[PDB]
Amino acid sequence: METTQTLRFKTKALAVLSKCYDHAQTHLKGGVLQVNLLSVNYGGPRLAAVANAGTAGLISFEVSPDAVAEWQNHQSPEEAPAAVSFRNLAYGRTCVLGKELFGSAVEQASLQFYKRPQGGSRPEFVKLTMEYDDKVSKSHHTCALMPYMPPASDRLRNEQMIGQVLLMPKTASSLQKWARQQGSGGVKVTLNPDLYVTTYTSGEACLTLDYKPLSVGPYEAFTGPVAKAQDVGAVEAHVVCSVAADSLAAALSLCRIPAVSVPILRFYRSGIIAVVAGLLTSAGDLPLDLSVILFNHAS
């Protein structure tokens, strides 16, 4: 058995995300764990819990490379994949890997991808192992990788961000509730730079949220921790997005992590939207990049 790649995290790195994972736990359960190698020499490897949200949404519970302690790709650059991924809910078992992985009592978490010496050009298995606080307890999980998929966190690299608005906790819940009220319907999201307003409509139903302008462009907004939670926004263009009410509801929920993050809506020139979890200055330097992509939903 040969090792294709080795990935190991720093002491207790992933444990600080324990509560964050718990918040997203229910949505991440039926998804998959995925390590993005496609960005190894672009910051480092990126492990992420990836799953669906609603009728047209993709969650990416991603860990910043800052959490990585050692990376090793033993395959020729040309053989290694852009990404490997196994399913979060391990084969047969009752244990959800993401839960154990992002556990708070884990000192060292690490992954090892293997293949059989003979036939097979790409990794075929992964071996997660978590070593706990007690300096005594270990857990090793051997799983089969899945049919290759691109890095979830790769679908927006060529997209153009025309603005993003921070949603104050109450506003977020308010929207999140409205979205839920719309069931399996669609929501037409409207960004109006002129009116400093974001609008959502689903049939006759409707909802309007105002926002204070930031005398700065999209890409220069919310670059660091969110020091204040207020309905603020940096928009530089109009746009209408057709998303699924249910996906929007799940996103707003997941990105508002108690005492940790507040939802930030990122608008793209194409009809696409990405609800991002803006980290509060309080919740320290969590190596988290949580987002949910709202795909185009034909109503």
For 183, residues 6+ apart whose C-beta sits below 8 A from its C-beta are 245, 246
Question: Site residues for its own copies, window 125-154 (CB under 8 A)?
Answer: 125, 130, 132-134, 136-144
CB of 253 to Cl ion, least distance (A): 9
- 35 forms beta bridges with 47, 84
121 binds, among its own copies, Cl ion, none (CB under 5 to 8 A by kind): Cl ion
Question: Site residues for its own copies, window 58-117 (CB under 8 A)?
Answer: 90-96, 99-100, 103-106
71 binds, among its own copies, Cl ion, none (CB under 5 to 8 A by kind): none
CB of 133 to its own copies, least distance (A): 6
Residue nearest to Cl ion (CB): 121
Helix (H, G, I), strand (E, B) or coil at 249: helix
Under rule CB under 5 A, residue 121 binds Cl ion: yes
For 245, residues 6+ apart whose C-beta sits below 8 A from its C-beta are 54, 179, 180, 182, 183, 184, 185, 186, 187, 202
CB of 105 to Cl ion, least distance (A): 26
250 binds, among its own copies, Cl ion, none (CB under 5 to 8 A by kind): Cl ion
212 binds, among its own copies, Cl ion, none (CB under 5 to 8 A by kind): none
- List helix spans (H) across the chain: 18-28, 97-101, 169-181, 245-254
Question: Site residues for its own copies, window 143-202 (CB under 8 A)?
Answer: 143-144
Under rule CB under 5 A, residue 250 binds Cl ion: yes
Under rule CB under 5 A, residue 208 binds Cl ion: no
Name the token pair of 257: 């992590």
CB of 95 to Cl ion, least distance (A): 22
116 binds, among its own copies, Cl ion, none (CB under 5 to 8 A by kind): none
Name the token pair of 180: 């839920």
**Residues 173-178: contacts with CB under 8 Å, at least 24 apart:** 173/252, 173/256, 174/207, 174/209, 175/200, 175/207, 175/209, 175/248, 175/252, 176/249, 176/252, 176/253, 176/256, 178/205, 178/207
Q: For residue 64, give the DSSP letter.
A: P
CB of 287 to its own copies, least distance (A): 20
Closest to 33 measured CA to CA, from 47, 16, 21: 47
296 binds, among its own copies, Cl ion, none (CB under 5 to 8 A by kind): none
Of 90 and 265, CB closest to its own copies: 90
CB of 284 to its own copies, least distance (A): 21
Of 167 and 251, CB closest to Cl ion: 251
CA triple 194-179-165, angle to 5 deg = 35
Catalog residues that contact its own copies under the rule CB under 8 A. 90-96, 99-100, 103-106, 125, 130, 132-134, 136-144
Catalog residues that contact Cl ion under the rule CB under 5 A. 54, 121-122, 250
